[PDB]
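step=encode ok
step=design start
structure_in=
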């Protein structure tokens, strides 16, 4: 699997941005393509 906007979305999980991370976390979704 690719997984890119997840590594970045991981930081938000600890930078009190776990919520905003959902956004940048949606970019990691690399299953369809």
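sequence_out=
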């Amino acid at each position: 699997g690719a997984d890119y906007s997840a590594q970045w979305a991981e930081y938000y999980r600890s930078v009190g941005k776990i919520e905003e991370a959902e956004a940048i976390e949606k970019t990691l979704k690399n299953k369809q393509n």
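step=design ok
step=annotate ok -> The helical segments are 7-12, 18-26.
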